[PDB]
């Protein structure tokens, strides 16, 4: 299977212009990162289907603004996939990952 | 000016295979990052001389085992850059970044 991660994030103060994810495989490889732009909106925030053409258990995230300009959360965090997907929400200035929709 | 980052990098365990430098831009303009490769030794460890082709005053550094696999010091350091010149000095898991030979 290749790998679909979706993420939700959502900003306070409604300013979004240049925020973007940088994302790395971790498992079962480390590699380099990309950047990934949000393509769409919900309720929550902005939404990013980001799509990975290789198996993956666990990538790791950064929010950034523009290129590293600025981090929403400076240290990194990691995305556990199972069966080639996941699903994260992210809010502004808040570590935790979350699995649900808050 | 051009800038040049001369980088001295030792560790305890005599280990060097994959280590290298990630190193980004910060100011005036912050840059995607790029990957330096050792190309020396002095008496001190690994020497790495980084050219960039801009006058900087800050970058990132940050020393990782091949894309990421891991990390020697896992948080975000910088190098100040005056007269786009710098040297330091970096020691296996001290998070300190020394501007003279300790």
Do not use: C
């Not at 380099?32 to 902005?46: I, L, R, S, V």
């Not at 995305?79 to 992210?90: F, H, L, P, R, T």
């Amino acid at each position: 299977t290749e790998t679909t991660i979706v993420v939700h994030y959502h900003r306070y103060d409604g300013k979004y212009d240049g925020w973007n994810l940088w994302i790395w495989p971790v498992e079962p490889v480390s590699q380099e990162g990309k950047a990934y732009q949000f393509t769409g909106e919900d309720d929550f925030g902005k939404v990013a289907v980001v799509k990975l053409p290789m198996d993956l258990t666990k990538v790791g995230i950064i929010v950034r603004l523009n290129e590293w300009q600025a981090k929403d959360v400076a240290k990194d965090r990691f995305i556990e996939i199972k069966d080639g997907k996941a699903e994260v929400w992210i809010l502004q200035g808040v570590e935790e990952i979350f699995y649900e929709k808050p």
